[PDB]
Amino acid sequence: YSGCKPRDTWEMWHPTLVAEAVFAIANIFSSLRLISLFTANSHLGPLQISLGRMLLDILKFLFIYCLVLLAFANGLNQLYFYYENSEGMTCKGIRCERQNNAFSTLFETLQSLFWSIFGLISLYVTNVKADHKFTEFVGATMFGTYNVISLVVLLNMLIAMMNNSYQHIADHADIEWKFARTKLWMSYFEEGGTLPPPFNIAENVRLNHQYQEVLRNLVKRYVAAMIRDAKTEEGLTE
Amino acid sequence: VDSLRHSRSRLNIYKALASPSLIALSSEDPFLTAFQLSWELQELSKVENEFKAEYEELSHQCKHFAKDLLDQTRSSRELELILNFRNELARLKLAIKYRQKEFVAQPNCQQLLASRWYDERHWAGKLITCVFIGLMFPLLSLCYLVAPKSRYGLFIRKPFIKFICHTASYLTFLFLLLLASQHIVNPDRQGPKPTTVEWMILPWVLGFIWTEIKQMWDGGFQDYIHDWWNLMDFVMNSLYLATISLKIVAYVKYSGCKPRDTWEMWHPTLVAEAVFAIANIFSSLRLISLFTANSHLGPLQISLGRMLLDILKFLFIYCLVLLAFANGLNQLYFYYENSEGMTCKGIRCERQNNAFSTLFETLQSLFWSIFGLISLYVTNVKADHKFTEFVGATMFGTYNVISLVVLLNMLIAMMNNSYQHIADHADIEWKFARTKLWMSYFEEGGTLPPPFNIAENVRLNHQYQEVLRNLVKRYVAAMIRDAKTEEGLTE
Amino acid sequence: VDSLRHSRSRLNIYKALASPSLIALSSEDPFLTAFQLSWELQELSKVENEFKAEYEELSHQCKHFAKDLLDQTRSSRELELILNFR
Ligand SMILES: O=C1CN(c2cn[nH]c(=O)c2Cl)CCN1Cc1ccccc1C(F)(F)F
Ligand SMILES: CCCCCC(=O)OC[C@H](COP(=O)(O)O)OC(=O)CCCCC
Ligand SMILES: CCCCCC(=O)OC[C@H](COP(=O)(O)O)OC(=O)CCCCC
Ligand SMILES: [Ca+2]
C-alpha cells in the first residue's frame, strides 16, 4: 500500500497497525529487562533475588484461580445468553461509556469477570429490558458469590502463603545474591565481545606437583582441626 | 459420687495401657490394640473435655507407636504378608478406616502402592502419552464392554488407565456443557423440545446419579456425608433431576409460542434455565477435586482446604454486625420510599436510589459496599433535612470503617497464625488423601466411564505370628534399649 | 525383585561414600569427588522420590564439606594455585 489516505478510514489487520502494536510490546519488554542489572548493587541486589525466587510460589495460585474463573464464567454465560440486545447501541461490551451486554457471549464474560477484581465493573450490568426479577436476582447472586470467593478467600490465602514461604528465604539471602553477582562478574573477564552493541561491525605435567603438595597440607589441616578438636565439644549422656 | 477421684483414676488407667512396653508384652495383636486404643481415646477426648490435652496427646502417642512398629521390616514379602491379612490389602483398608495418617504415609507403603498402581520420561515423555491415550478412550471402553477378553480388556484393568479414561470422560462432559450455550446450536419460545445436545448430556447425568446411589448404598448418609466433596455431588444431582422435571412439566402445559419479553416471573422455563446454570457452576467447581493426584498442587490444595473451617467463624461474626447496621439504617430511612416517576428502583439501576427504603434492599446495600460498588449520593432525600442526612452518612461511614479496616485485617492476622501449624503436617495429609484416592481404582467395582453404564485361613496365621514375633523382637531391642541411653545427665 | 532391600542398600552405600573422613582418606582429588557426588545425589533426589529428604540432605552435607576444605588456607598464592587449575 504505497499511497495515502486518512487513518480513520482503515480496517483492522492492516499491516501498519500490526507493525505498531508489536513494536510497543517490544518496548515494554526491553524496559522491563532493565531490572536485570540490580544484582550488581548491594542494597537492591538481595531484595531483587528474594523477590525473584518467590514467584514460582505464585504461579500455583494463578493456576487455581483460573478454574474458579472458568466455573463462574460458564454459569453466568449459560444464564444470560438469551438477551443479546445490541439494538440501537453504537458500542457494545464492557468498555464503552455505558456498559452493556456484559455477559452476552463467553469472551465478554471472561473479560467481565476479570475486570471485577479491581472494581471497575458497575452494578447495573446485570439487568434486562424485561422485569424478570428472578433471573436478575440469581445473576446478581452468582456475581456476588464470585466476588466474595475471589477478593476475600483467594487474596488472603495468598498473603498467608507468601509470608511462610518467605520466612525460609531470608536465611540464604547473602549466599544466593553473591553467587548471582559472581555469575555476572565472570562474564566481563574474557576477551569475548569487549565492545558495546552499536559498534559491532614442565607446564601441564609438572604443575600438578605444587597442587598435590597443597592438597596434602590442606587435608592435614582439616583433619586435624575439624574432626579431632570438634569431636570433643559434644555433650554427655548415660 | 466422688467425681474427681473417679475421673483421675480413669485417666491413670488409660495413660497406663497406652505404653509401648506393656503392649509389646501383653497383647495378642499389637496393631489392632493400637488402632482400637487410638479410636477410644480420640472419642473420649470430646466428652471428658475438661481433661482435653492429655487424651489428644495419648492418641498421638499410640499412632506414632503403630508406625514405628511396622518401620523395622526388612523384606518385601514380610511387608506384603503384613498388609494382606484378615481381596487384598485388608489391613490397609482398616488403617484408612481408622485414620492412621502417620501409618499410611510411611516410605515403604508408598513404594508398594505406587508399584501396584503404575505397572508401566521427564516432562514430555509422559505428557503426550497420557493425553494421547486419553483421546481414543471409547474404543477401549466398548472393547472391554462387548468382549471382556484378553485382547484389550486387560488394558483397562491397569488402574493408571482406568483413571485416565474416567478423567477424559469428565473433561468431555465439561466441554459439552461449555458449548451448550453457543448461539450456533435458536429461536427462544415457550416450552421448547430438548435441543440436540440435551439428548447428548442426558447419559452423563444418569450415569453419575447411578454411581452416586450405588456408592451411597453402604454409608447410608451416616459416616458417608462427613466428606464435603460428596455433599456437592448430592446437591448437583438433585438440581439436575429438578431441571429434568421442570422442563418436562413445562413442555406439556404451555405448548405454544410468544415473544420472550412478554412473559412473567415464575414461568417454568426460566426456573428451568436458572437451576441448570447453577448446576453448571457446581460441576465446574467439582473439577478441582482431582488436583490431589498431582504433586506440586496437591499439598497446596489440601492446605487451603483445611484452612476454611477457620473462616466460617468470621463469616458468622460478620453477619451480626451486618444485621445491626441494617436495622439501624432501615429504621432511620424508611420514611422516604419515593418510587414516584422512577422506572427502576433499587441499588441496581443506572441511577441508584431507594437504597435503604426497605430491609432486604438495606441488606443488599450494605453487602455491596464491601467492594465499593455503592455510590455516595444514595444517602439523600428530596427535602434538605441535613441532620438526618448527616446521621445516615455517619452510620454508613462507621460501618465501612469497622468492616474494611477491623474485620478484614483481623482476618489475615488470624489466617497467618492458623497457617503456621499447617505446614508442619503437609506431606502426611497429602499422601493420606492421595492414597484414599488411589485405593478407589483397584477393585473391579465400576471399571467403566459414565456414558457406557447400561490350610488357607487356619494355617496362614502361622507365618504372620512368626513375623510379629520377629518385629517385636527388633523393636524392643532397637527402640527402648538403645534409645534409653542418649538422654542426658541430672543431679 | 526385592525392591525394598535393593533401594535400602543403595541408600546405605551413598550415605557411606559421602563421609568427610573416607573422602579425605581414599580420594585422588577431594574437590572433584565432592562436586560429582553432590550432582549425582541431587539428580537421584528426583527419581527415588519416596526417599526424598535423605538425598536432599546428603547434597547439603557434601557442599558444606567442600566449602570447609578450602576454608583452611593461609596465603594468597595457595588460593590462586587452587583456583587456577585444570
Ligand atoms: O466425584 C465426582 C463428582 N462427579 C459428579 C457426580 N454426579 N453429578 C455431577 O455433576 C458430578 Cl461433577 C464426577 C467427578 N467425580 C469423580 C472424579 C473426580 C476427578 C476425576 C475423575 C472423576 C471420575 F471419573 F471418577 F468421575
Ligand atoms: C453474608 C450475608 C450476605 C447477605 C446479602 C444478601 O442477602 O444479598 C444476597 C447476596 C448478593 O446480593 P444481591 O444478589 O444483590 O441480593 O448474596 C451473596 O452475596 C451471598 C454470599 C456468598 C457467601 C459464600
Ligand atoms: C477519623 C476522623 C474522621 C473524621 C471525618 C468526619 O468528620 O466525618 C464524619 C465521618 C463520616 O463522614 P460524613 O458522615 O460524610 O461526615 O464519621 C466517621 O466516619 C467516624 C468514624 C468512626 C470510627 C469508629
Ligand atoms: Ca462421591
Residue numbers in the entry:
A (entry chain A): 459 to 659, 696 to 732
B (entry chain B): 187 to 272, 284 to 317, 324 to 388, 391 to 659, 696 to 732
C (entry chain A): 187 to 272
The article reads:
Here we report five cryo-EM structures of TRPC4 in its apo form and in complex with the inhibitors GFB-8438, GFB-9289, and GFB-8749, as well as CaM. Within the TRPC1/4/5 sub-group, TRPC4 and TRPC5 share the highest sequence identity of 70%. The cytosolic domain harboring the ankyrin repeat (AR) embraces the coiled coil helix in the center and the N-terminal ankyrin domain is associated with the TM domain via a helical linker domain.
Its binding to the protein is predominantly mediated by hydrophobic contacts. The nitrogen, the chlorine, and the oxo group of the pyridazinone ring form hydrogen bonds as well as halogen bonds with N442 of helix S3, Y373 of helix S1 and S488 of the S4 helix, respectively. The hydrophobic part of the pyridazinone ring is stabilized by a π-π stacking interaction with F413 of helix S2 on one side and M441 of helix S3 on the opposite side. The middle piperazinone ring forms a hydrophobic interaction with the Y373 while the oxo-group of the ring is engaged in a hydrogen bond with R491 of the S4 helix. The tri-fluoromethyl benzyl group engages in a hydrophobic interaction with L495 of helix S4, and the fluoride group is involved in a hydrogen bond with H369 of S1 and Y646 from the TRP helix. We hypothesize that the direct stabilizing interaction with the TRP helix constrains it and the adjacent S6 helix thereby arresting the channel in a closed state.
